[PDB]
Amino acid sequence: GSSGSSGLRPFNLVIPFAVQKGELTGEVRMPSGKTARPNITDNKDGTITVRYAPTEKGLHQMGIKYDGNHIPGSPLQFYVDAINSRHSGPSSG
């Protein structure tokens, strides 16, 4: 296709998994032929936030772990498509 302005929406998801006295690690695999380490924001409230910035569009493989144990929900598949232009959905207070 084209080479430059790709634009790919970020990956923001919250998995129901508590985390207090443990480390949560993960990894992403792009269809290009490489791998990039995702991001996790431990809330220590009973859930975890996953943030990943895809560079290419396609099916990516995300494999998370917990102190050496496949968290309840990983790995997970997430497709990446070009960022939309417009979208309905007003905000409220």
Q: Domains along the chain?
A: 7-83 (2.60.40.10)
DSSP structure class, residue 60: E
> In angstroms, what CA-CA distances link 51 with 3, 60, 67, 91?
24, 13, 19, 22
Way the structure was solved: NMR
Token readout for 47 is: 């859930």
DSSP structure class, residue 73: T
Q: Please list, residue by residue across 53-70, b when 16 or more beta carbons sit within 10 angstroms of its beta carbon and e when fewer do.
A: ebeebeebebbbbbeeee
Strand residue runs (E) in 9-84? 11-15, 24-29, 35-36, 39-42, 48-52, 58-66, 76-80
> In angstroms, what CA-CA distances link 23 with 11, 31, 62?
20, 27, 16
